[PDB]
Symmetry: C2
Subunit: 283 residues, 2 copies
Amino acid sequence: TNQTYKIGLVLKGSEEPIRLNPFYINVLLGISETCNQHGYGTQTTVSNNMNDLMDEVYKMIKQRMVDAFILLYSKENDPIKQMLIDESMPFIVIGKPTSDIDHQFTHIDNDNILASENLTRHVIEQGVDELIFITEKGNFEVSKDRIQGFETVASQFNLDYQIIETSNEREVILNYMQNLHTRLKDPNIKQAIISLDAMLHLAILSVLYELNIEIPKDVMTATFNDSYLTEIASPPQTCIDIKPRMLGQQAGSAILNILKNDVIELVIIDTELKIRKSTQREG
Amino acid sequence: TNQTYKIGLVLKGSEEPIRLNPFYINVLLGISETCNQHGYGTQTTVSNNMNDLMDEVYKMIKQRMVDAFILLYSKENDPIKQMLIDESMPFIVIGKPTSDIDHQFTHIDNDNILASENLTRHVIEQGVDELIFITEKGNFEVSKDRIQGFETVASQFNLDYQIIETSNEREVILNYMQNLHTRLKDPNIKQAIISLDAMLHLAILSVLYELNIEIPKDVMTATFNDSYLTEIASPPQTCIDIKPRMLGQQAGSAILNILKNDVIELVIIDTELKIRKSTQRE
């Protein structure tokens, strides 16, 4: 191992809704403060696409710039996870183990099936007929896990449901909600919309405002990752708190412990449902 | 001799209303980018209150962990600004020069009197009869500048207006907006609400959603500090783009120039009006 006392933190992208995403802000704060309490510095990747991220992480390996890495995402056949495996770099992954070799490498995750099941159950407890899950593109394991938990509680209570995969584009979201507008306005059908993540959810609420689809009256809404932004959304949003500052602190501790020396295969951080106005009946 | 090649980045707090604000996120990216260009690293303060902040800036000085500081705010009688003048630390301020001694130090700021005037003018072009400016507590220089701009244009155009000071606390905001509820619902009186900053603005919109006061039908709304939070607000908001990344880069450049060397007193970064649905009542 190197002797830089620095940890490289690999991000998914540099995009405006990613570097402003309260998930990454809190995860990186969690990592950095822990690292900084033990004499370790941090270096966040700034790359915005896969070929460039393969380039800039390889630079960090070859120029011996850091001692270790923390991958801030999990994906099946991740070539940059393969890079760190090929070039013998110690690392942590924030996300779900997906393979045989993943037994060797410490992962830090939430239980994303349970989190979604908890959220999906709660909306059913308020009384719904039909459910909608809205997700983002990419073969991300967090997406797969949260979809799976949603589909399981929905099937368990024999409810009708649909999955919508969308980009964050206003026009694109608008078209999807235009299609549902008439059913979303039907007073005989009780509906709930669940989004993958709060940043995507905020775009949804904006389109729902534009179409005068009122919450909770026409539809109930909920999402993942509680922060100040879901708290002061229009209306305040029911959400699963996934403790991103805790996730970061735990990843920071794990990588430090690896550099001291044993494998802890998977560390699970408990989540918490926060009930707000968007799933609460006004009477 | 024995320079650290690090810059202390001093914020007022680190809680999530602050640290999730794309203004601070973008100014901090802007500073670091310019610093990491020229070999310098950065060290961002983590304290939430004034007591912990003073203690940690003092410790940064005493244990010499940074060469210089950037203050990411401007307020009169600032105790950490006084601490840096006491300890002769090289520093710059992001915000308005206030005091007699503030002549000595570079400030990087927006044209906040003018940008609020620009915003008030745009709202008035759409046709209004009354105007409300909502500000946050704590007499910062950015508040006074934005209220002054507002007041000058609103009085010039012979318009009725009020100034509301509030905390970001939900039930305080709710109480304020419930008093205006009947007036805001009136189809004969045209009104506009302007908030000090996008993050406070969002708490306002959420209370407006609660009270069934639709935008821009019942009231037009607008604020300062353009980001994704105003672009995808409910509804998208008209706002002043105050250029936080560029502001950060000019701060990064100003401090590196102070350490190399005779002091540029004020840098102004221009702002841009961004018109969206919330003021588009046509």
